[PDB]
């Protein structure tokens, strides 16, 4: 009949309040939205596009059927649009497209493929519902037979998450690769034990005695662990945050279970039924540097004689450092909408409330990939509203929005975005919002801002103001913020000044240089430099108090004045006289109570053209060996006598 291409040809083309179209009119069209629309906002335009079953990609590629070009379009977007030769339309263009493609079908193979995929999803949902009702009928028949000739819990009284929890591995949606990897690792654990965990297979999982599953909340980590443990015929010994897992309890608790037979396995007699699978769930839930037992669990991971699976939500936390390279790491990513659309449709039809498949993705966006949260949202909403569609999708999504604290990189990216500092953008993301964004991680926000405020192309420059001037203003404000921070952490503990520190350290300098990140966002380098400075100051103090009885100065004077002459009288002789100057160097060292470690540290202090790394390396190894032998073959004096 009519193909979307001919409609687009009819629609006016662009070169470098809305009509109610028929259902799924934009089906099979990949609409990429860019710029600013006159009447519709980005969110409103995306919602309108989804209302008609149109894929809304966040980027532009060869599959971008159409493009919605508005005011203030991204330069990269225009560059890629011209490179890929993709048509663009205006607000009236989109209006005519929705009102000029009513057949909702009959277009090219893309529309037919989309319809076939939708029918396949519906059929899968119906088949799953049929299986569920068959299971319910079987359970009811067994219950009636038992009753005819203990109180059980009826399914109607159970939470939807429990009622629809996966029963086997296949029912787990998303993270198929991770699930398969875990299954393979656990299946061949006995073979790895036979090889003493020395040989590594194709996947390299044969050298780990423990596995660590990590991912965001409500994605199926515990479910997958339990399912894999049950499938391979193991006995599960599970621990969680509800149990005491301190170092003492760990030593007196599960430690004895590492190499112990299971009595239940013996009395329930698979060949692996007598062996334990120790599941430590919510591993990040234990607090304590040493008494918590995180380090103790890491040590256990290195000698466990039975499979050990750890589960945590935050793998990069400092508390998790002991688990660096001792367990096989398995990441569970946020599942995509498609992998769970069939499950959501099955739940919707079984619970006898209507759910529009075109809004499911939005619900996922509300929950940030939290399947448990999605099921809870459906259960709570369906109690009063039996139909879910575009009529009330916006309100439901806004009400249940998951306000997750941003990470330092995301905080830096958002705070340095120039849009939020414009007249229009400031009314949506207010100053209070920016202060809250700082308070998300007050400890790291000022450091990230100071690190990344010189690596942006600004878009908020005032007329006649250069990038350098704004940078200087931001630096001045950052210095004032540092003064305020010093005030906060003094003996007076003026924590009430924290909000002001938010403005001076992050919000104001960011507003001065807000724009587009000219390059990759970098983590703050100040902490590593501070640690290096502390180490070097400790070394300098050690050297100074070794030579105190001979010199007349403070440690700073020793670094600035004495060290060059000491270099001239310690390093130059080796380079000039070869190995014949070892005696003079040793004599100078003895005169000042210096040791070999002191010699190396002194050589490590110099900068600029006096760096000694290359010079030290170029020295023949024989000279260094002779120097070490001569130093070790004699007695030396001691400056500080420890007792």
């Amino acid at each position: 009949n009519i193909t979307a291409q001919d409609v687009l040809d009819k629609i006016p083309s662009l070169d470098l309040s809305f009509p109610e179209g028929k259902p799924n009119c934009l089906l099979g069209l990949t609409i990429v939205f860019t710029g600013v629309l006159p009447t519709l906002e980005r969110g409103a335009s995306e919602a309108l596009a989804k209302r008609y079953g149109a894929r809304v990609t966040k980027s532009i590629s060869s599959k971008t059927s159409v493009v919605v070009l508005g005011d203030e379009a991204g330069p990269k977007k225009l560059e890629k649009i011209k490179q890929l030769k993709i048509k663009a339309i205006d607000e009236e263009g989109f209006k005519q497209l929705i009102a000029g493609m009513p057949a909702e079908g009959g277009d090219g193979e893309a529309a037919e493929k989309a319809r076939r995929k939708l029918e396949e999803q519906h059929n899968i949902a119906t088949k799953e519902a049929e299986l569920l009702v068959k299971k319910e009928e079987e359970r009811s028949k067994k219950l009636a037979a038992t009753r005819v000739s203990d109180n059980v819990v009826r399914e109607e009284d159970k939470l939807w998450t429990v009622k629809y929890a996966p029963t086997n591995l296949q029912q787990v949606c998303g993270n198929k690769g991770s699930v398969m990897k875990l299954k393979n690792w656990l299946a061949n654990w006995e073979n790895s034990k036979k090889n003493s965990f020395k040989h590594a297979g194709k996947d390299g999982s044969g050298v780990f005695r423990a596995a660590m599953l990590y991912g965001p909340p409500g994605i199926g980590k515990t479910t997958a662990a339990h399912l894999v443990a049950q499938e391979l015929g193991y006995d599960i010994l599970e621990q969680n945050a509800s149990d005491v897992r301190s170092k003492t309890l760990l030593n007196a608790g599960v430690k004895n279970a590492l190499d112990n037979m299971s009595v239940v396995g013996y009395f329930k007699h698979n060949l692996n039924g007598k062996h334990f699978v120790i599941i430590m769930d919510e591993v990040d839930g234990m607090s304590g540097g040493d008494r918590g037992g995180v380090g103790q669990l890491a040590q256990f991971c290195r000698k466990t004689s039975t499979p050990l699976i750890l589960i945590c939500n935050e793998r990069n936390l400092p508390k998790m450092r002991p688990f660096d390279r001792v367990c096989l790491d398995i990441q569970f990513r946020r599942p995509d909408a498609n992998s769970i659309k069939s499950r959501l449709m099955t739940i919707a039809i079984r619970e006898k409330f209507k759910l529009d498949p075109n809004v499911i993705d939005r619900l996922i966006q509300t929950t940030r990939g939290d399947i448990r949260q999605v099921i809870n949202l459906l259960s709570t909403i369906s109690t009063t509203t039996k139909t879910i569609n575009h009529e009330n999708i916006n309100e439901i999504s806004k009400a249940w929005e998951k306000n997750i604290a941003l990470k330092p990189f995301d905080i830096a990216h958002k705070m340095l975005d120039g849009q939020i500092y414009s007249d229009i953008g400031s009314r949506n993301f207010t100053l209070n919002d920016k202060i809250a964004l700082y308070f998300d991680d007050f400890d790291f926000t000022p450091l990230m801002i100071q690190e990344n405020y010189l690596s942006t192309r600004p878009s908020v420059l005032k007329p006649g103001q250069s990038h350098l001037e704004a940078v200087a203003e931001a630096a001045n404000c950052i210095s004032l913020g540092d003064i305020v921070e010093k005030k906060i952490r003094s003996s007076e503990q003026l924590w009430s000044l924290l909000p002001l520190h938010a403005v001076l350290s992050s919000v104001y300098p960011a507003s001065k240089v807000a724009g587009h990140m000219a390059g990759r966002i970098n983590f703050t380098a100040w902490l590593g430099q501070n640690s290096k400075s502390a180490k070097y100051y400790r070394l300098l103090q050690e050297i100074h108090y070794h030579t105190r009885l001979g010199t007349s100065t403070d440690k700073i004077g020793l670094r600035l004045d004495y060290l060059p002459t000491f270099r001239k009288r310690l390093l130059d002789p080796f380079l000039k006289q070869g190995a014949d100057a070892i005696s003079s160097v040793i004599e100078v060292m003895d005169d000042y109570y210096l040791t070999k470690e002191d010699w190396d540290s002194i050589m490590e202090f110099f900068v600029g053209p006096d760096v000694t790394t290359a010079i030290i390396k170029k020295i023949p190894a024989t000279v260094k060996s002779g120097f070490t032998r001569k130093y070790n073959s004699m007695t030396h004096p001691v400056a500080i006598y420890r007792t």
């Binding site: 009284d157 969680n240 448990r372 249940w400 909000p499 507003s511």
Partner: protein, 318 residues
Amino acid sequence: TLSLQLPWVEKYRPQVLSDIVGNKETIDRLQQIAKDGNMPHMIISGMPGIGKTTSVHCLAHELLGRSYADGVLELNASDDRGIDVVRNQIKHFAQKKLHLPPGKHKIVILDEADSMTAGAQQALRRTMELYSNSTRFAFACNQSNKIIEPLQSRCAILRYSKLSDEDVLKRLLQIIKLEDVKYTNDGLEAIIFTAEGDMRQAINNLQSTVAGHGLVNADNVFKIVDSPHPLIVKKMLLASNLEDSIQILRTDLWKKGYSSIDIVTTSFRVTKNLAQVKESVRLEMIKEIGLTHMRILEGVGTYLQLASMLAKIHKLNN
């Protein structure tokens, strides 16, 4: 006199879901849940004095009836709620055997849950997961962000909105009719304006005004309820001439006994929430206010410093 009159906030505390005003959709959802049961884990968040504890208690009562005493475990910030409590008392309550109708469950009400420690919240996770067949949890808090993400994932989110002046007026009229309180429209308007959507504050102010003066009119209401100083600070910051701002500072704030620290903190907050002013100007005003706040915290809390702050703000605005 050794006798006390019961506060009207307690005497007229709603006992059923139908007596709660505001947040109509959430109240209807709670009513439906009470009718049908199968209450899920829930987190109720919102501003102070809007009827969160009232809603939770009413829902529990309608759900459990005669079994309320046995089937409800209530814990708040005044009770012990450490990790040991979660691991022993709450676990014992969850595992407790209690025969209930075919659509009811035991309820744990953790009021002011935002004050609970991270360890207790973490320990609650598997307790909620394992015993959901017989026990359900209802958290009530002011800031939902303090609740860890795993607990939020396990609960249904109910964000309470501020009460509109219409609902406050409706409840106040019911209370007045039940108490036979002589009033005037202007007095009720003043009470509503001073309440700022706080039903508890409005009821307390009404009761205090009736006790202290009898007739509820603007004069008596304002005598009992002082005009909020944030509005005075906003007027001071928005004054066109430095002389007017200094006049307001000296007459409405300094001579009334307001401390300099309170004045400067309120100025900071009001400037932060001043949408009518350009954001960059607000940032400059905040810089000046922070300088003054640091000076006051150091110990120089004088009227001269506040006057200098106002002068600098006006210079910036010019």
